[PDB]
């Protein structure tokens, strides 16, 4: 099982000091810190086996190509996709959603159709669908929230109809920490012939994820939140849908033939969706990140994190005038407001105490609006965070209270 | 000035051995090796200042945001853009071309219009325009080649007309090493009201590049060819055009406001075109790469490389039955065929001698077709390559000749 202290000693940024104080990094929901195994796997790859990966003859290139197709496989196993060919390497969740929206969206959603998202979505699971609806004349319908941060599921009967082509929904909210009941919802959507895109940017680091049990048609996530590098993410599409999708970006490596007088032909899935040099260094790093989480055990992480969350919720009970947002069973993040202070001031005092939290709309304006607040403060409690970091948060909020109140 | 030996000692992969032999990496045109200053700038950033960059309050995040906006500025200075706000961070040249093609292309090229590319383009400067022409009903016209690997400029009068909305052309060919006369061509295009997109993936590492003197409207290049990481590239657009372009990817950070009942508004250029977490690690690395080239001096590099090229061309003169393709003044790469052996066999023998060259169509099928060959072999002679690596190439080709002939 889990030793938080052994885990923290893998993360070099956690030794840092900030504003002369010891960093309490509580913003892993925005981007996670990377263990040195991740950092060094990327660096070693650049120091020793670097080459172009376009299935080259020469050795380094042939080896780099295989290391990359191994990360594809490993990622596919990590989410239990049926095969490696169902995963497309993207820049991150956001790019993965725009690829679906354009490639699948353009040939499957028509004027008069509708698409459903929820009021808790992140802007990455909003904007691309908004753009698709404008382009084709479809309607974007929304599942409303309940006060407690959970979706009003009683509204589906009225949102799902025979024009519903897609449900795009978050696994886990980045502000509320709510986990949506994806499997039952996917069951429902599928009964109307609607596909489901699952945004799992805040799910893959907290517990095991199984796309076959989910039965989601599309699943997306980013590496930088899952202790990996930036610039790399994964888009999973069911083989049967991926095989009919037309290309989105065009260029090198995604074509089979290119003619200036007979036109161009495409290569097969997944490679049809990856144009030009891939972020090979980010792919190697992402494989390291996946091996590092799998070796900790998602179920040991989940367990440590859950207990940390319970500890935090319980101590925050003694911060006066604290508003929490979201369900009690929240995963990963704690979204809150302190009395009437603007979150911006609350996060500047916390920052000034060496405590990193995220403050603002969190790329979720419609969720702020639902709560009728312009912004919120948010703490992430990841696998490398401690009781002591929690205590500093509580104390800092109490002091912010005393001083500004 | 330039010490090739001092330069090589910065590149860790050049000490490697391959197939038990000392690597002679002659494939920098496909992707370049990275100096340890580049590798370590990325790694240090992850070990010590890592955070989300979405203009966060907390310290690390505020610092990461500034490091990134400094790389934007530095890149803008490296190509002499008038300002930092004319550069968009992309995955690489390919993504930069698809962004222009969609964002600018969709609102500016209509049914009946035409777009001009050349017969030497790379697939990245082909495919996106092919897709745009299919979507809107425009015609893709091509500047033909001369035998020597130079464009037939006498054909422009017949290709440019009042329906020509764009010229997309390479700076430097990745197979022939030809440098197109961009400034005069841009002058011409502009006289018809056509914009010009310059593909400079093979220009930025060989000599200084100045987008104001060029007067190109769009310029693209990738970091992995310019001694930098993967997953990061630059798209330069003239401020006046960039300011009217609508967004391409949607999501976090590129919006000003997001409403589920009043619609969404956009932020300003460049940030309107960057959705979701950026490849922050690749950006830091790209800044290191830019500082490392600028400190060598593009003009010292150009000079060393040119002399290396002259040395190579002269020794290859004693390889029997060698076909070279491209002009004598070629930059960077040497494209060739050995007698009647398929390039694939030539590159496997070379590989087996520890010599990495690229063999195939090089993501330029129309250029192979022009030469009526399915493929070619290609050597890159970059700033870290030596006379001795050239000699091994020549010797290996002579032996391949003797054995297979």
Curated annotation (Swiss-Prot), chains A, B:
Its EC number is 2.8.1.7, 3.13.1.-, 4.4.1.16. One of its GO terms (biological process) is sulfur compound metabolic process. Changing residue 122 to A: Loss of function; possibly due to destabilization of PLP in the active site. Induction: Suf operon is under both the Fe-dependent Fur repressor and the oxidative stress dependent OxyR activator. Its cofactor is pyridoxal 5'-phosphate. The modification N6-(pyridoxal phosphate)lysine is found at residue 225. It is found in: Cytoplasm. Displays a strong preference for selenocysteine as a substrate in vitro and is only very slightly active using cysteine. The interactions with SufE and the SufBCD complex act synergistically to enhance, up to 50-fold, its cysteine desulfurase activity. Keywords: Cytoplasm, Hydrolase, Lyase, Pyridoxal phosphate, Transferase. It catalyses: (sulfur carrier)-H + L-cysteine = (sulfur carrier)-SH + L-alanine; L-selenocysteine + AH2 = hydrogenselenide + L-alanine + A + H(+); 3-sulfino-L-alanine + H2O = sulfite + L-alanine + H(+). InterPro entries: Aminotrans_V_dom, Aminotrans_V_PyrdxlP_BS, Cys_dSase_SufS, PyrdxlP-dep_Trfase, PyrdxlP-dep_Trfase_major, PyrdxlP-dep_Trfase_small. GO terms for molecular function: cysteine desulfurase activity; cysteine sulfinate desulfinase activity; hydrolase activity; protein homodimerization activity; pyridoxal phosphate binding; selenocysteine lyase activity. Pathway: Cofactor biosynthesis; iron-sulfur cluster biosynthesis. The active site is at residue 363. GO terms for cellular component: cytoplasm. Homodimer. Interacts with SufE and the SufBCD complex composed of SufB, SufC and SufD. The interaction with SufE is required to mediate the direct transfer of the sulfur atom from the S-sulfanylcysteine. NCBIfam families: PRK09295.1, sufS. Belongs to the class-V pyridoxal-phosphate-dependent aminotransferase family. Csd subfamily. Cysteine desulfurases mobilize the sulfur from L-cysteine to yield L-alanine, an essential step in sulfur metabolism for biosynthesis of a variety of sulfur-containing biomolecules. Component of the suf operon, which is activated and required under specific conditions such as oxidative stress and iron limitation. Acts as a potent selenocysteine lyase in vitro, that mobilizes selenium from L-selenocysteine. Selenocysteine lyase activity is however unsure in vivo. Can also desulfinate L-cysteine sulfinate (3-sulfino-L-alanine). This is Cysteine desulfurase. It comes from Escherichia coli (strain K12). The gene is sufS.
